[PDB]
Amino acid sequence: RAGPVTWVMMIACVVVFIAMQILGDQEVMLWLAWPFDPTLKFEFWRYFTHALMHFSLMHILFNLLWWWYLGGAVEKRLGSGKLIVITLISALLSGYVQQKFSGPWFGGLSGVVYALMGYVWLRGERDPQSGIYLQRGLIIFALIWIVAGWFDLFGMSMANGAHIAGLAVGLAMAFVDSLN
Amino acid sequence: ARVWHA
Ligand SMILES: O=CNCCCCc1ccccc1
């Protein structure tokens, strides 16, 4: 369940995770975080690379899990390019909304993952011929995660903006895709 | 540090 886009993104999160253990989280935030200073305005990778940072074993394992399953689903059934666009768009909008709500010091693939949850779900309700559906197990687990975010019942501050923006994007995209 | 987890 892992084509080249799914695979490179995981390797990338792994390579980044390793880089955060050697150099420490802070120094990698300085290079990959959303622009936290006017000077950084034009370091363009930053509008996407926040999606690559994970701050703990739990963070990266859960994000990579969802990603591998839904993202790898989107890849094999709908094509690599589609997963690419979903990822670029969600990563961008989730980053924007997150930073508008809580500053630039955030990271994680979960904005992307929430777009995948919303896309694989709504695409299957409106266009079940697509072959694309969020199995009810995952509908439930996706609901729970979401609720976990909004009411903040883990140990760390949740990127609530990145989540909402993420889900919005994936809906809009599956909506536009199910038109016919 | 505190950072927000996405
Ligand atoms: O990751 C991005 N946003 C929130 C998802 C929560 C990931 C997680 C789950 C359990 C423990 C730590 C992190």
Side-chain angles (χ1 to χ4, degrees), chain A residues 56 58-59 62-63 107 110 145 154 156 158-159 163, chain B residues 5-6:
Chain A
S56 85
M58 282 305 116
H59 206 179
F62 274 114
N63 274 323
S110 73
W145 267 53
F154 320 91
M156 68 292 180
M158 292 280 86
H163 294 119
Chain B
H5 296 57

Side-chain angles (χ1 to χ4, degrees), chain A residues 117-128:
Chain A
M117 290 172 188
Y119 182 91
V120 170
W121 173 69
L122 188 155
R123 183 67 191 282
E125 275 328 282
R126 270 109 189 282
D127 187 346

